[PDB]
């Protein structure tokens, strides 16, 4: 399967199933700073999922790794703002994260499968 440009559509649907995830809600539109002030004092880049989709749709994103390391990102930011291990938001983040992995992996592998048989010769 050596389709080069397939991850796009896959990252679309799987941004879907997130988006369709009630544990999704917190991390869908950009904090609010006017909300939580001191954001910006902790968070140094900002990322939430309507931010990841519009760059996949204006043509932003050459790989699906670098999408990947924006919705890592909302995970490590939401870690770095969470006060316990045992938060609310923080059990969301969590299983939101396992299901974003399970998913991404074929995602990755089939993309970089594509471009080393394009290179093979
Ligand atoms: C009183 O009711 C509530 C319940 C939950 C919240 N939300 C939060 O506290 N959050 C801070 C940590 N987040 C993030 O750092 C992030 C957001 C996108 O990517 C990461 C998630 C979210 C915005 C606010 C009020």
Redesign the pocket.
């Known amino acids: 399967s050596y389709d080069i440009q397939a991850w796009k559509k896959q990252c679309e649907e799987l941004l879907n199933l997130i988006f369709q995830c009630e544990d999704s809600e917190?991390?869908r539109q950009?904090?609010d700073l006017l909300?939580?002030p001191d954001?910006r004092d902790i968070?140094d880049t900002?990322?939430?999922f309507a931010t990841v989709r519009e760059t996949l749709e204006a043509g932003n994103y050459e790989s699906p790794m670098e999408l990947c390391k924006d919705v890592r990102l909302?995970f490590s930011?939401?870690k770095?703002?969470?006060p316990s291990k045992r938060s609310?938001?923080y059990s969301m983040?969590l299983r939101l994260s396992a299901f974003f992995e399970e998913h991404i992996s074929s995602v990755l592998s089939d993309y970089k499968s594509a471009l080393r048989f394009h290179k093979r010769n």
Request: hydrophobic share 35%; charged share 15%.
């Open positions: 917190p991390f950009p904090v909300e939580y954001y968070i900002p990322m939430d909302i930011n939401s770095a703002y969470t609310r938001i983040s």
